Assembly symmetry: D2
Homo-oligomer: 496 residues x 4
Amino acid sequence: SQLEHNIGLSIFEPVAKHRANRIVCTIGPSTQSVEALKNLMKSGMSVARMNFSHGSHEYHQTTINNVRAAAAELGLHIGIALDTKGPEIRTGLFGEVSFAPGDIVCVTTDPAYEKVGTKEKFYIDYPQLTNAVRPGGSIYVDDGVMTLRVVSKEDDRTLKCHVNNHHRLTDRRGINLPGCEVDLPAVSEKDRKDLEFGVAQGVDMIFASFIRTAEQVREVRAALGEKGKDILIISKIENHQGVQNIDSIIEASNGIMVARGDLGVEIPAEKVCVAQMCIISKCNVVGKPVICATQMLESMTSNPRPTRAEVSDVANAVLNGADCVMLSGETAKGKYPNEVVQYMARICVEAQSATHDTVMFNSIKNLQKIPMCPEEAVCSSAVASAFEVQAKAMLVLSNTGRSARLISKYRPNCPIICVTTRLQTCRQLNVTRSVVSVFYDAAKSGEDKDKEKRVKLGLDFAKKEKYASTGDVVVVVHADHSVKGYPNQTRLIYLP
Amino acid sequence: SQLEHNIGLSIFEPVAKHRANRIVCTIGPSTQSVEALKNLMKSGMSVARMNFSHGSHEYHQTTINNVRAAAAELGLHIGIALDTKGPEIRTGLFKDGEVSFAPGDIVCVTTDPAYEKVGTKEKFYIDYPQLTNAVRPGGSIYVDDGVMTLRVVSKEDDRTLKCHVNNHHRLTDRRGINLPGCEVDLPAVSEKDRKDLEFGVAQGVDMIFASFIRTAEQVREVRAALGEKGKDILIISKIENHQGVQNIDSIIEASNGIMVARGDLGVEIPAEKVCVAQMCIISKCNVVGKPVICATQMLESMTSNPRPTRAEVSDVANAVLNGADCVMLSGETAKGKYPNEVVQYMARICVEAQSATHDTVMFNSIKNLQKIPMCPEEAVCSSAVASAFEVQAKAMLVLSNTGRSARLISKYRPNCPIICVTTRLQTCRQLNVTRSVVSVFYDAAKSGEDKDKEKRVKLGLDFAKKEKYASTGDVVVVVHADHSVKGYPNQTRLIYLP
Amino acid sequence: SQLEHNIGLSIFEPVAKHRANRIVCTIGPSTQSVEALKNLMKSGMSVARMNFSHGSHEYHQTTINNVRAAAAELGLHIGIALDTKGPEIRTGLFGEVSFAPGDIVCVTTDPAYEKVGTKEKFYIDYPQLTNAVRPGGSIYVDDGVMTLRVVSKEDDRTLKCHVNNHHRLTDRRGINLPGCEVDLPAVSEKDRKDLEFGVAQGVDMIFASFIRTAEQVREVRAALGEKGKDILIISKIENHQGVQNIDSIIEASNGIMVARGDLGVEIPAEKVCVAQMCIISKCNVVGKPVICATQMLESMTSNPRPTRAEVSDVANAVLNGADCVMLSGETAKGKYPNEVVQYMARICVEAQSATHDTVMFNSIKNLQKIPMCPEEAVCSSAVASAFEVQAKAMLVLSNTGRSARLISKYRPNCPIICVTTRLQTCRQLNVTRSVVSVFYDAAKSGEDKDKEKRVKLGLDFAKKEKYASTGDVVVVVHADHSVKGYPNQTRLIYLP
Amino acid sequence: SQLEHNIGLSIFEPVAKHRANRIVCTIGPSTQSVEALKNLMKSGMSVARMNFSHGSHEYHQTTINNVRAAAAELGLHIGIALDTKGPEIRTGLFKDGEVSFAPGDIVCVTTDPAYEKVGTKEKFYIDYPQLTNAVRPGGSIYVDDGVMTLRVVSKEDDRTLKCHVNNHHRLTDRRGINLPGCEVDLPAVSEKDRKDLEFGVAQGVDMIFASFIRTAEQVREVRAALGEKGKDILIISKIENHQGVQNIDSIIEASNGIMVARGDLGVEIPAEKVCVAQMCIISKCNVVGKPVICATQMLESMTSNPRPTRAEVSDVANAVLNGADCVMLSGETAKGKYPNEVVQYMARICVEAQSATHDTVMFNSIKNLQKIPMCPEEAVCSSAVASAFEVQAKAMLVLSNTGRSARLISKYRPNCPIICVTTRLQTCRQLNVTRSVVSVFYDAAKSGEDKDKEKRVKLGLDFAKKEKYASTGDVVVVVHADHSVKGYPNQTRLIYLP
Ligand SMILES: O=P(O)(O)OC[C@H]1O[C@@](CO)(OP(=O)(O)O)[C@@H](O)[C@@H]1O
Ligand SMILES: O=P(O)(O)OC[C@H]1O[C@@](CO)(OP(=O)(O)O)[C@@H](O)[C@@H]1O
Ligand SMILES: O=P(O)(O)OC[C@H]1O[C@@](CO)(OP(=O)(O)O)[C@@H](O)[C@@H]1O
């Protein structure tokens, strides 16, 4: 039981030597230089997030170039993620006002009130407004620091609203419709240009904002088009629809972000913790990477030490089952970008060492539909045989990354060394728990039909990184001599 | 499995009507007035914490009087907790009242009290005579809440360590010292604690939060300090350093309860190791059935902001999921801008984590670790909770004079309120640290002996009905003694509310 | 796990002192005298079975009188069971023949062939014959020592049959239709007279032969009528229909007999073991007594020692979960009636001591629909609290026996002392595992509204029978001072 | 749970096509002819047992030759087992060749060999010199297969016990003696066993069923007796008395397998305690992965009747449910009227009990009791069986030269056939005592080295197809070594049948 595992926990035992979970950092002024990036990588960054809410194509190009130069200097494969600005609902032009508690205000969707507007009749660029918010429900303004409650519908396009608290305003502020189905495009026009940038520049994954339906995930894929077919889509769940539609969004995506900042505006703050637990477990169950985001070490934007709550939050995201934990402002524009990543890495390792070896393995395995595909039977059994011999490492050949993700899904307690023939697989596997990638250049080194070259490369990597030594058993997953497309074989071998 | 339970969780379902977990609030200038305290109680405060690190007896008397007046007007039973300063290690003074250190700086620290008032950048005093025994070369000394770190380089003599400063810091008079990973032979109770404890006993406080408990032997010395007049006051031991964590079993045995004092603990042990200690300490309390409080920075940002961070919301939820009876607020309510709002948030998060808890998993896990044979009252209490799950009881009702039997039922983590009918007002107040329990006072002076339990049972069932725990025709599980057994409950009944 | 429980088993540990399972014996010439019966009771008999297949009303009256006198001498409550002859299918008159392997024969249902018949055209008194057995299936003759396979339908009422083996014949022999729905009456005319005898003489239960449907169980109850409303009906499952309809037969009956002798003729012999396991567990799950019958110690009809298979069979019926095990020929007409019952009792105790304490409790509890009725919550929790304190006995007040059966359903490891106000409850509880009955005569002793007299009677019985001593905890189940109709209260008390 | 599994059982469902359990038959005048033996093999005999309690070497040679000829004509691999007489305790002779005892009779028994040929009602010989040490006053001596019982009353001298006869019995020359609950210091092997063992080794028998094993030390003495030429012959130890049961762990360690010899055991220990020993011994073999045979009277009534009793059917089913690899027939096939029919019945009951078994419960239970870390081949074998369950494999295929790896897979109780491709005919024959296994012989003399395993794998997959275990496009789990590892299998593959 969890309870019996807990009472056996000790703060005096050595922690795991090899960190399983993965850290995503947002880049910004704190961290854009090649030097800052290198330190960030030494500190524990596996994925660089470009927040496309702000900055131009030129700014983000500097980010891209600088990441790639930092990584080449350190001999690392660092994934690069494009986080889209996303379709959004905003007020029209004004140039300011002030709305102290108790006021009564009118919001219009007629586009002749866009450039005009005042304390009494201002624009909202969402043209379906008087559908979504029926009388009695709420309109959130500016990440919901200000709440408005609609009484009724004035003309076809205006609603009447009782203001609830203090606040100032300015043009083009952010609007939320909490608990309301929102019928926006998956992809804004700015998003189209940003995605096609991302394709052209070869980003590894897209963090797709405000994903509400499976259909919107497919819109994002079609926009990536043919040249972008192998770019991961990580759907950001940000409102009640996302949560409602989670099953089918998962099916459509390569992975999920629990985008708690935005989600905690759209749904009551205390319900985010139910959503988190639910979503992370649903992803664990299908073997798709999941990322926990937002304010995880927030106070380290300004302090050299995190709060007790913040350490807890990181530990528990790991215990919940998240592959990755993310940093936003902490690394983008904080005083202590390196220290915050180092803390995050230590907390990960600690939560990982407190995790019961085999509980996830069994739980996940018991929820799988029988019969399995052969490769999944091979990968789950390989993880079982890793526990059985206390393997210090596993080794998988994977070109797309599929097989690595499939092993990671069963949650072994050792590193998964993935020898791959694709640089982009090395980068994309950065969002998958446990996996460590080694590139085999098949053009340079030859075909390796019998797998011996890649196996040797992987076993030598295990020695060099001090995962294992001579005479240690390693579990090795790839195809036999004739099967193509997936691994059908496991071997236990002793390092020479 | 947890994993299967998670995938079935819903944000769309109604949440539990009755909050199981309890909230301890620290009182300060934000919240000390009668009016502020009524608001706090309405928002969900069950225990008022006084931090005796600060403030005179007069300040705290006002807190006590105000809490009592507020609770009287509302008809609530509210616990009052006295949190001791506890013994301390501190530097001496510095010349000019301050001195600045940079990395690489070598400084001698001495336990020779000659140097107490004349600290410099070269040499300063630390008031712990066992210093040169406690930290060897290589070991660390933490200054000013760990903000500054010293590596001990060598022992110069039997009272002097040569140290290396690890980082930039400005140091003022009499800063706190922490000796990570060292035993520490301070008394259980300082001279000041005695005057505060005596004050506590005189004013009739319900519990001590005893600072810096490292051994069971110190818990007993706190009990001895409270004397005969304080024999009934709960001792909740604060676990604050590596020793406390290492001796947790015997400290639990000796205490009435535990507080995981995360702020201090995370200065003594690496910050990341606090989550491991929390999970362990909380579970070990659950297993023996003693209340445990989780403390420190749980909603810290709401000291200034009307909304908590995402980290802070999950912290509260996860403390409840770990199994904590209580969650605590410190500066959030002592000194903060939004003391009502933060208690309201804490209460909402509590209810949400409770509703996301698998109903029977704790019950089973806790039951499976008990030694067999149980004493009869524990077999009675655990089997009552089992019966409650089996009929989906909306409430349980237990007669308890000391609180023992209420705490014993709560140990098994029912998913419904536990209505306790008690003959002691102090039990009413002290059950505020116990999950699920709701107290009703039976006045035996007014109403008579109640040997056959009928009046107390009627009072409880009326309470359940009035307070909307249950309605006519609902099954309620009722635990007390039969007509002859004395000293503990040997009987369980299932009863339809009349 | 079962496997881990097994490897811990020891043949050197003391066995349980108090036998939980119950033994039914068939009476006959070996065992009809008052003396023989007394020894049989001393040996371990809890229920006397009168086999109404043979013997007259007068013969069985002697059995009844003699049982009641033996029991009164020993101060015991012995249940008396009437096992009905049952509707049956038989051939017509002949006066004999012989059918060595390979022969070809014709069977008719025209009743003008009843008194006549020979090697070539003999009667079968089941008039729906050419419906049930379609060409290709089989007709069993004389407990299926002889099998016949039908080729086709000659005239409306005749079938043509290929004989399969040697055998002789005589008038009025037993016929089975293996795998065929058989549309007979639940109650034969002989059965009506026998049941009304049973009512008049006050038998405790009816072992109802050849029960195929719930509806037939109700026919048996209606025949018992008003004066017999409280007589247990134990339905004997004897063919594939019984097995198919088991759920609804269980619902209708007070209990079940797995009538393996008859069942092993109707269905393939090896399938009886699947049926046994299934039926016994279904009864355990609803808390209704079940009896395993037929050939359990067969060879002890003639030998003073059982075979290894026979000892195994008894042990495993107990391990399967059966309340009772039965003896037929072994006690009715064997040389060693006392020894066979003594063996059976020792095997029961051994299997009981090898049973894991709490596995049944949990298994049964986990299959119950939540919410439970209050009395069932009380009874299951009382058994849980018995395990928790290692109670040496439980004590229940029960007038109908309902509450005793409900405690027994949760399978405690100690005796269940039942204080009852009805002599017939004492007798009927003989088919329920663990239960030991004490009669409280309320007319003689008074009302006992506060339960103290019956509780004292039960606690004194616990002392006298050496279940418990002064200072032992006992779990005591009855109503509180105001509730009527069921127990709502449990207490743990120390024997004074 | 078992209980939930039971309630879902159906008599109407199709049963498994391939029998997992194996059947050992004793050969006698009913079954010795080539023709009788072909019929027996077609009916399901996998191992032919010779009972060396009776019969000359010539009789048994005929059995061996006939078994081999029958199996050759059918193309079957059939194990041959030699069951030793074993050492014995017996009475001496009586005057007039007999003597009758009644209850209450006092009789002296002596270990003085002077009395060996002149037993009377007053005094007779028992050929066990340690008698007066082994049974104290109060203890029992069992005569003539326990049919007669003596209570030892007193010790008259160092070679004479005064006894009380418990029951009526007529006693003839040289009846068997059993000393219930006493250690018994007979040799592992009698002088006769040596000539039988030597005969066994010369004729190339596949296994010994070694009688009356009480200690691991005796198992080793049987192995030493078989010498170098018999180093490869399986020793299946017969557990026959309390010692055997008490030392089962070390006897298991020393043996290749166990037979629960219920007939003899139930003379030594109370008859009811045999079910407890059976369940324990069978499970302990399952846990270490050594074959276990259940024996004695399993279908006894079919010695004379064409149909078994209800007890006998459940006995076979329950031995299979306990976990026995094999079930045995003795007189049923040696001396009986219906030797084919009884084997056919045994086989049908086996298949029914197998189909009623929960597929994965054994796998899990067995796996959870293994020490971690496993050796790599056991991790390979148990994980292969896991993969078989996960894809609902219709067969597994394993390369094994000694049988070790086949037995290691069988240990984990897959629900499908385990096809073993072996390079030794003797392994083919010896795998007949192992659940699920079906052997194919690869002739390395004819067909070559097969270093890369491809020929042996093809032979196995062809076998699976020909024998209707699986068809084209079915997944099959395949276990052997990779191209470099020697001595054990380090590799598992899932392969679609071509
Ligand atoms: O790229 P994924 O989809 O993970 O499949 C990789 C697997 O396919 C195989 C066989 O096709 O790759 P490879 O051909 O490169 O040797 C396996 O060896 C390898 O484990
Ligand atoms: O006869 P059953 O149906 O078991 O009900 C008996 C129960 O009812 C009660 C209460 O009605 O009987 P009683 O009135 O005889 O005292 C309980 O005390 C007793 O446990
Ligand atoms: O005879 P056992 O002990 O089963 O060992 C057989 C195993 O060893 C190996 C390797 O040595 O045999 P082989 O050399 O005959 O190919 C594996 O292929 C095979 O599975």
